[PDB]
Amino acid sequence: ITSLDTENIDEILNNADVALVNFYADWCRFSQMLHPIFEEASDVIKEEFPNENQVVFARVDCDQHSDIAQRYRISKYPTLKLFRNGMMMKREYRGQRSVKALADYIRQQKSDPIQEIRDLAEITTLDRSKRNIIGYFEQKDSDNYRVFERVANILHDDCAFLSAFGDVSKPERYSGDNIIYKPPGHSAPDMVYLGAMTNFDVTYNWIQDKCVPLVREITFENGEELTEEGLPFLILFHMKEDTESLEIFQNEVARQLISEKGTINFLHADCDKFRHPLLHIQKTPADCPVIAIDSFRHMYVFGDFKDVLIPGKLKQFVFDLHSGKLHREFHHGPDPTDVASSPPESSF
Amino acid sequence: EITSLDTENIDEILNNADVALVNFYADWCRFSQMLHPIFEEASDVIKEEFPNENQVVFARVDCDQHSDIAQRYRISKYPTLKLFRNGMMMKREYRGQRSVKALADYIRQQKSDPIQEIRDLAEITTLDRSKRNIIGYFEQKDSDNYRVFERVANILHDDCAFLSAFGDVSKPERYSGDNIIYKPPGHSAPDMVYLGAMTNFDVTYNWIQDKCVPLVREITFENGEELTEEGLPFLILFHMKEDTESLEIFQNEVARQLISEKGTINFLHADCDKFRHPLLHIQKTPADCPVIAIDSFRHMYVFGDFKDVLIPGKLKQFVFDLHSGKLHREFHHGPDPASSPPESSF
Ligand SMILES: [Cl-]
Ligand SMILES: [Cl-]
Ligand SMILES: [Cl-]
Ligand SMILES: [Cl-]
Ligand SMILES: [Zn+2]
Ligand SMILES: [Zn+2]
Ligand SMILES: [Zn+2]
Ligand SMILES: [Zn+2]
Ligand SMILES: [Zn+2]
């Protein structure tokens, strides 16, 4: 049960197929309760999963490395996060902190969610009220299959994943390995992915696009769970009758922000229900549509909504977050366009 | 020169410095990066006018490397410039321009003598009673007494006018030697005489500060930023503008229980009509008032039933639970007595 420093963390988590990370602090009484329990689970599991990088338990002293904790937006202790090959999973571990409960959790997360087809007839009897994604491969031992198996482990909660190999899948491989999305119901045709199947990012992107919405609604009921995903929010606040704002926002996010997809969460929020957050940026529902970023540290305002129509402005807003420009302008006021400087401000 | 400060050396360096100006910065703050040459230039200007060791000390704190020092002084944005006197942080933070002149003029005014010496005791009879006045009658200016007086006046000159009388002049009022006398506002208010040991800084400072600064202040839209800049958490009373009874109770109970905590907490009271939004943060409304809450700038913690202030020790325990981390633990994990995960609110 390893300890992650600011230098060895990327090496360790990337090489771990599954890693359960304990983000703790010494002053958290509940953190100290966990260290023996996290050790015992670590050994119960180290025996059931002996091989190198099958399951890897680590921990992060969030006092020592405030930057690491800031990276995954850890704000309270202890917080247990799941990583697959160095990528944090949306769903935080919120089960009980018992040696038993941790072990059962790792047990599930290590189970194979992919159903292997043994006869192509099975595809005609799939449950069409769920979404189904079928991967047709020459062989299971292929870079193609390994990318697919990664995507399936990340997304099994969102979609059913199936596989077929060799002689079974040959009739569907006229043009090589491919992936078929069977949409729910009977109203749309299958979509076929014949692209960069060794490319995790592109393949993950296409599959994920089929089974989670690009812009989700944040509500009181799902806010905490969305915060637990570890990313800042890019939010459109808008009235329910206001469908044009959402349409514009959805299109500009889809056109401009695909490369940023995994570093920020795209959300929309009913401005009547979110009157209080709108206060924090000196807005009322009458002011909507409003675009804002919520970095958890602060909430930053985009400007006139009609500026989303200007090409690249939405991208630049996201870029200004990650560059630190939005934070700087929040305490120090707008950067110069092209005498001596004032003190930083609480809100400005 | 600009001294870098870590945890191993922070208290030594600032304690020995009669005046220290500290630059709390962060490498990623562009205004911090701009400040570093101006800060070095200002210390060089001031090291010329103030040569002796610990006359004026310019130092800096990389708040990334030393998050705990930053937390100690409630630094939350950069660059923040604080003034210390012999290790004690002055409540007013440096808010002037970050230029060499503005810095230098500020250090020059802080080093200046704020006490006015009176040539004739006729000046105390004609003394302006629209103000708080403290008068020190001394044997000589080379006293140890006067140097404690000088130390207190340097800290509290913004809160009170300090006058001194020496030698032949003060001789009549020194029937019993050196003595300090407070003249409250209004020609009708009686004099209150200091009785403690004038060579004792801690004791003379506390008596003078009690006559100078009210124990409980009202936080308003105007002074909100200033109060935050004092670097102390808030123990605040939310009451209606007409609810004077709750306020009197609060002031009494604070004076009875919390004088030990006077330097670590800011005692405040606020009109809950004009602060409806912060009350909303603790699931309270003006109807729910009176409310007692601590604002720790991380979170806001509710005391419970306002009736419980009258139970001896319960208000003191509220503050103790803040410093012991108990309030923060219970905020994320629920009341103290396998484990449930932490929550952002319970
Ligand atoms: Cl915590
Ligand atoms: Cl900044
Ligand atoms: Cl800053
Ligand atoms: Cl805690
Ligand atoms: Zn907290
Ligand atoms: Zn905790
Ligand atoms: Zn609020
Ligand atoms: Zn900030
Ligand atoms: Zn800054």
Residue numbers in the entry:
A (entry chain C): 2 to 339, 349 to 358
B (entry chain A): 1 to 337, 350 to 358
Task: Please give me the paper's original passages concerning this structure.
ERp44, a chaperone of the protein disulfide isomerase (PDI) family, cycles between the ER and cis-Golgi compartments to patrol proteins that pass through the BiP and Calnexin/Calreticulin checkpoints. ERp44 traps its clients in the Golgi, retrieving them to the ER via KDEL receptors (KDELR). ERp44 is regulated by the ER–Golgi pH-gradient, which enables the protein to capture clients in the weakly acidic post-ER compartments and release them in the pH-neutral ER32. The present studies reveal that Zn2+ regulates the structure, function and subcellular localization of ERp44, providing a Zn2+-dependent mechanism regulating protein quality control in the ESP.
